Design a protein around this ligand. Structure first.
Ligand SMILES: Nc1ncnc2c1ncn2[C@@H]1O[C@H](CSCC[C@H](N)C(=O)O)[C@@H](O)[C@H]1O
Ligand SMILES: Nc1ncnc2c1ncn2[C@@H]1O[C@H](COP(=O)(O)O)[C@@H](O)[C@H]1O
Ligand code: NA
Length: 280
């Protein structure tokens, strides 16, 4: 029961990919003056201490955000994201990492809104504090999957829905698919971004098969692996599955994925790909 702590992983290569994609979608949504909703089902604490015992135990951020945030040849597509990270580390030392809600908080406009949920009794109060002074946001201690029913469609009728569970419970692999189906039924023009870990490739193949079976079209897959697939314990890769991606996203990812992979994976192992699960 909610034993997962994101602090162990905050700012690792999966977070870099996830937040790169999140930021690019937000920038696309901002192109039109009309307001939109940012809905984060599994929101986390908001920000993470990289000097914490958890972060330093794995040191995963050292192979993630650390490898790109001070690069002089940073691709333009990453500027919005990296500028948020720099805002939280103005000393130039890498000490704090902004989670999805804070990236959203700093990229959204005055007219936009945020709806965030987190169940963990350490992380929810921290998330609440991050948004006490920002009336654009609503933060609730409740099941994120339920929000795909309760909060869609938004009155603004525009939005990004980030679904980023920890997959501590293996039912998550089914729940993300059923949850997307329910949300899509209520709000078919929404942009849905689903993060997934590759611990067992067969789990992911089954998940993608289930997603195809919903009949939903226009499904883009973006994956970055630091190691080839393995049956061993660890996560060798992660990806973003994006439903209704903005028209530029595929090209933007083709522009930045090789650079990202070269920086995050100096040994050149694994892969990085963008492809359609379901076209048109
Ligand atoms: N059913 C559920 N509803 C809401 N939060 C959940 C949940 N099950 C697990 N969680 C929380 O989901 C989170 C996944 S990590 C979230 C990271 C965040 N989206 C970011 O990018 O920074 C954990 O904080 C965990 O406590
Ligand atoms: N966000 C993440 N980033 C990197 N590794 C992760 C993440 N979530 C889970 N893992 C790893 O995936 C493996 C399987 O998780 P578990 O079975 O819960 O230990 C463990 O090695 C975890 O550390
Ligand atoms: Na996770």
């Amino acid at each position: 029961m909610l034993s997962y702590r994101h602090s162990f992983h905050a700012g690792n290569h999966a977070d870099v990919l996830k937040h790169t994609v999140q930021s690019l979608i937000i920038e696309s949504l901002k192109e039109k003056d009309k307001p939109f909703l940012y809905l984060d089902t599994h929101a986390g604490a908001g920000r993470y201490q990289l000097g914490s015992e958890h972060a330093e135990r794995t040191g995963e951020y050292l192979e993630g955000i650390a490898r790109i945030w001070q690069q002089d040849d940073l691709p333009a597509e990453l500027e919005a994201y990296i500028n948020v990270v720099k805002h939280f580390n103005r000393s130039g030392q890498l000490r704090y990492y902004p989670g999805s809600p804070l990236i959203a908080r700093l990229l959204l406009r005055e007219q936009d809104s945020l709806q965030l949920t987190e169940l963990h009794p350490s992380d929810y109060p921290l998330l609440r504090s991050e948004f006490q002074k920002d009336s654009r946001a609503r933060v609730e201690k409740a099941d994120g999957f339920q929000q795909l029913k309760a909060k869609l469609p938004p009155v603004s009728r525009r939005g990004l829905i980030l679904i980023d569970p920890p997959y501590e419970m293996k039912t998550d692999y089914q729940a993300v698919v059923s949850g997307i189906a329910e949300g899509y039924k209520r709000f078919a023009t929404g942009i849905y971004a689903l993060w997934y870990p590759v611990v067992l490739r067969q789990q992911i193949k089954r998940m993608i098969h289930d997603l195809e079976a919903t009949g939903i079209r226009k499904i883009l897959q973006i994956e970055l692996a630091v190691l080839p697939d393995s049956d061993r314990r660890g996560m060798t890769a992660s990806g973003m599955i994006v439903i209704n991606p903005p028209w530029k996203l595929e090209q933007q990812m083709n522009n930045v994925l090789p650079w990202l992979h070269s920086k995050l994976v100096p040994a050149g192992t694994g892969h990085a790909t963008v492809s359609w699960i379901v076209p048109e």
